[PDB]
Design a protein around this ligand. Structure first.
Ligand SMILES: NNNc1ccc(NCCOC(=O)NCCN[C@H]2C[C@](O)(CO)[C@@H](O)[C@H](O)[C@H]2O)c([N+](=O)[O-])c1
Length: 765
């Protein structure tokens, strides 16, 4: 029955708009298969279209906003694009119809509505782009009755081993199609839908924009050749309408020109299913999907006071839909340095200069291919997997569809190498590589990243302890299924644990360092003078200079998080030899956090180094780092240390702003310095951890109960209102929030762990 549920999940999740890097497009969870993409742009002149056309996601002054209004990857949803430049408000509805043996059918409706500023007679070019990779697969446009293009629907017939037999139809659609009186209409028609079928080597099929432009250019070249000129030029839109040449190939370009408002549909019909999909089907399923989404939202994200109002409900649906609608499928090679140069060991003073020299050797090579199914921090700026981000993305996703979250964990864990390493950024394939400068593509097997995915696993364990509806929860309703999942995953968690202890170990025994355990001390590899990218907290101030004797209290705390889950899961599997080892490490970390990291003087945790004169020195920068033992759930509810941290969190002159907890204290010398990334702004992921821990203390007998209750209440309020006010004003979730003004700054469309705000509002942790 475990294998049964796995097959049902496979079939359920196969199709999706799993191309978050573009406004709109579909692909299935198969590396080499069928992919679709939407392009549009107004055409007003002979040279404007190339600047107006939209394809990959961006955010600038010309695009007001975009995102999913509702989305469930099992069913589909609706996306809204608000394009100032092209004067267009676009709707893309996408829906899945289960059936057959090949992962079902789907349909999309693309609807374009001119805004008020647009000339009533704007010409808009719309392109649907279709590609198929594979050695033994086929795809063909059925030619039209008419000479020059299509009066009605365009039918593509294809086949592959992955998908079997299928048909993809691009319907005729509603809207005025402009007509030309030019001479040229005698050879190119007066204006009609057109198809060009082409073939390129598989590996470049993804470059839709250049492929399309290469065709437009050849069209124009043909004009110049055949004596069409400025004596008497055809209208711009006709100059950019391709000559109709349907046939067979691995690329098919469907082009339409509309005057005024438009709509058309794409229907993908799996032949192995019932009868083929119709437009009337699409409308039904769209309506049905909405109802289903609505009802689930109210059960799963039941917003509590003072956020019960409809305004906060629209806000919640927007934050949730955009996070889950980021889910993508990636496939291809990664760029890894597998030299393991000894300089990466970072054992010397000045190691950063060594490791730069090792990097300058450039021994990195492509390897793979790999696949990943994952949600993403930002469609326009970060459309790929990020290790510790995913930990946060999956927390609300898990509430919604636990089986989906587990799928994404499985996907992530399947990437882990024999050593136990997973790269912190997953850039798979040329398409993903295309948005990342070369200098930043290379992953390093010594670079770790917070194991935030353990948090999601914790939520699963506690739920396990105490047809789409059925599938979404199958892994908790069927305990044998739950356990088998953990059984298969458990070894890899353990490998990761050990990998941490091997590669990220700090130096106790070689120094004048007294402490309860000789084993337990951690230092992030990869740090520069200015940065510690691997910790997640890029420029949070650390010991200067960096030094092989550093210990990092955040890293040690993460280790604690892992052991606690390893205990929980190990128990469920009866791996007693293991569970006993874990307990001794937990015990040691608890003592060692105190022995090595606690400053009695400052009243918080700190990172350590080694002096000019070789003694252990604590270095305190009051901020997120300082609270780590608390945020990660390691301190007992009656601890005096905890009480002292509650004082720190509450203190307006340190961390507590009207807008949330500041990343760094206003008292710290490093406040608001350098790039001021993690040196003062309010970050929702860390605020979320605090809100959760405060709630724990608040709902449990103890000395800090009512102080925590007070902080919980006010912090939940502050964080939600900050993210909400900004959403109301700007349309966007932001990466971080300004502690002085409350304004969102840095990356937009950050959904992204900012979306955790849905879980904060709904509460009852
Ligand atoms: N002006 N542009 N400079 C610039 C510098 C470096 C790079 N490439 C390194 C790839 O890493 C990054 O993206 N940047 C670090 C920012 N990290 C943020 C966000 C996130 O990393 C993902 O949400 C979280 O995980 C981190 O916790 C959080 O601190 C690029 N680039 O174009 O890729 C551009």
């Amino acid at each position: 029955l475990h294998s049964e549920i796995g097959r049902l999940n496979n079939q359920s999740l196969l199709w999706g708009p799993y191309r978050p890097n573009i406004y709109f497009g579909t692909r299935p969870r198969i590396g080499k298969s069928l992919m679709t993409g939407l392009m549009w742009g107004k055409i007003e002149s002979y040279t404007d279209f190339q600047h107006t056309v939209r394809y990959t996601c961006e955010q600038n002054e010309g695009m007001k906003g975009y995102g999913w209004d509702e989305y469930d990857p099992r069913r589909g949803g609706i996306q809204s694009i608000h394009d100032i430049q092209n004067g267009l408000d676009i709707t893309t509805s996408f829906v899945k119809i289960p059936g057959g043996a090949h992962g079902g059918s789907w349909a999309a409706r693309i609807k374009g509505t001119l805004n008020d500023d647009a000339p009533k007679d704007q010409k808009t070019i719309v392109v649907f782009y279709v590609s198929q990779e594979g050695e033994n697969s086929e795809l063909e446009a059925v030619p039209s009755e008419n000479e020059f293009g299509y009066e009605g629907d365009v039918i593509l017939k294809g086949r592959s081993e992955a998908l079997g037999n299928y048909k993809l139809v691009v319907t005729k659609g509603k809207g005025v199609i402009p007509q030309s009186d030019h001479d040229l209409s005698r050879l190119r028609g007066p204006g009609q839908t057109v198809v060009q079928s082409l073939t390129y080597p598989d590996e470049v099929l993804w470059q839709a924009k250049p492929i399309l432009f290469q065709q437009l250019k050849a069209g124009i070249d043909w004009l110049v050749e055949n004596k069409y000129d400025v004596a008497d030029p055809p209208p711009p839109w006709q100059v950019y309408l391709l000559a109709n040449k349907p046939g067979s190939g691995n690329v098919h370009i469907v082009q339409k020109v509309f005057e005024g408002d438009f709509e058309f549909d794409i229907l993908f019909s799996s032949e192995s299913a019932g009868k083929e999909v119709t437009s009337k089907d699409l409308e039904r399923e769209v309506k049905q999907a909405t109802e289903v989404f609505g009802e689930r939202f109210a059960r799963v994200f039941d917003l509590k006071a003072p956020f019960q109002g409809d305004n906060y409900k629209k806000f919640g649906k927007s934050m949730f839909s955009n996070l889950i609608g980021g889910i993508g499928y990636f496939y291809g090679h990664s760029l890894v340095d597998r030299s393991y140069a000894p300089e990466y060991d970072e054992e010397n003073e000045g190691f950063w200069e060594d490791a730069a020299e090792a990097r300058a050797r450039h021994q990195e090579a492509l390897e793979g291919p790999y696949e990943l199914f994952t949600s993403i921090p930002s469609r326009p700026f970060f459309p790929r997997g990020f290790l510790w981000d995913e930990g946060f993305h999956l927390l609300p996703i898990a509430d919604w569809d636990i089986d989906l979250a587990l799928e994404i964990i499985k996907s992530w864990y399947n990437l882990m190498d024999e050593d136990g390493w997973i790269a912190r950024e997953q850039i798979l394939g040329a398409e993903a590589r295309s948005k990342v400068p070369k200098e930043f593509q290379t992953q390093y097997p010594h670079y770790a990243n917070p194991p935030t995915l353990f948090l999601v696993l914790d939520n699963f364990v506690e739920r396990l302890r105490k047809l789409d509806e059925t599938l979404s929860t199958a892994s908790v309703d069927n305990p044998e299924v739950g356990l088998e999942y953990l059984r298969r995953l458990y070894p890899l968690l353990r490998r990761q644990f050990d990998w941490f202890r091997k590669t990220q170990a700090g130096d106790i025994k070689s120094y004048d360092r007294e402490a309860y355990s000789t084993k337990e001390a951690y230092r992030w590899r990869g740090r520069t003078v200015s940065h510690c990218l691997t910790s997640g907290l890029d420029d949070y101030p650390r010991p200067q200079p960096p030094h092989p004797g550093e210990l990092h209290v955040d890293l040690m705390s993460w280790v604690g998080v892992m052991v606690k889950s390893l205990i929980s899961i190990g128990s469920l599997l009866g791996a007693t030899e293991d569970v006993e080892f874990y307990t001794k490490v937990l015990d040691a970390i608890e003592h060692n956090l105190d022995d090595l990291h606690w400053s009695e003087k400052e009243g918080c945790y700190c990172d350590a180094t080694i002096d000019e004169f070789e003694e252990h020195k604590l270095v305190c920068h009051k901020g997120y780092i300082s609270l780590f033992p608390f945020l990660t759930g390691l301190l007992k509810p009656d601890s005096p240390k905890l009480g002292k941290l509650l004082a720190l969190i509450g203190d307006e002159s340190e961390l507590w702003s009207p807008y949330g907890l500041r990343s760094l204290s206003k008292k710290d010398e490093f406040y608001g310095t350098a790039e001021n990334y993690w040196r003062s702004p309010v970050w929702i992921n860390i605020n979320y951890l605090a809100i959760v821990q405060l709630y724990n203390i608040a709902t449990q007998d103890g000395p800090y109960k009512e102080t925590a209750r007070d902080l919980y209440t006010r912090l939940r309020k502050n964080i939600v209102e900050t993210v909400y006010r900004n959403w109301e004003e700007t349309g966007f979730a932001w990466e971080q929030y300004n502690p002085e003004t409350g304004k969102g700054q840095r990356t937009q469309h950050f959904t992204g762990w900012t979306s955790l705000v849905v879980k904060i509002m709904s509460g009852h942790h």
